[PDB]
Amino acid sequence: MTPIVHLKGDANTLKCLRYRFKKHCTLYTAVSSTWHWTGHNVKHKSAIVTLTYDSEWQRDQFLSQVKIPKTITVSTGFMSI
Amino acid sequence: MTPIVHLKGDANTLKCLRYRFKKHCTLYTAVSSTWHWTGHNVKHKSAIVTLTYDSEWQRDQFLSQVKIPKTITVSTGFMSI
Structure with missing residues (x-):
């Protein structure tokens, strides 16, 4: 099936993450x-986004290229x- | 697990559906x-939304209370x- 991650936290802290995905265009x-x-x-402000990966292996790669603050919870x- | 439906189509045709969910507040x-x-x-305009149900049985109920145009594809x- 298609893997789908779910991150949440301060709508502002999400603005910075989106930039990291810019250099990692070859990962999602x-x-x-x-x-x-x-x-x-x-x-309050709790915007949330989602990212689809072509495989679980590639999924662990993105998590290794971006640091997920301890306040943002991931999803599988x-x-x- | 948590069921999740996915509908797509003309961003405008989606505006009318959201209203139907208003009377069906006791379904999603x-x-x-x-x-x-x-x-x-x-x-072009292809906005998309999602709805989480507490169970698969309740899922078939919502689909019976709202008509999904033939242009909108559902997801499971x-x-x-």
């Missing part, structure tokens, strides 16, 4: 625009399309 | 803001967080 398959769980009642799963 | 677990696969070279998968 498709970057999604910044989005979040919208709802009638929100809380797979989709079918 | 978390609606995500409108987003899409951003990239240096885009094509699961995440782990």
Whole structure:
């Protein structure tokens, strides 16, 4: 299936990460625009993004090229399309 | 795991669907803001959204309360967080 990572944290701390993916253009398959769980009642800035990898092995590579702050939690799963 | 549906199509045709989810507030677990696969070279308006359900059974219910145009393709998968 297609691997999909999910990172979250301060909407601002996410702006800096996107830049790191610029030099790592040869590591992910498709970057999604910044989005979040919208709802009638929100809380604060917690924008979230997602990155699809062509394989799990390549996934560990990106995590080795970018440092995931301890405040940002990662996610693991797979989709079918 | 957590079920996750993925719909796509004309960014405009998606605006009408979001309204249907308003009356079906008791059917999904978390609606995500409108987003899409951003990239240096885009094509046209193809915004995409996602909906998480608490179970597969409840998933078939939402699909029965909203008509998915033949131009919009659905998706099936699961995440782990």
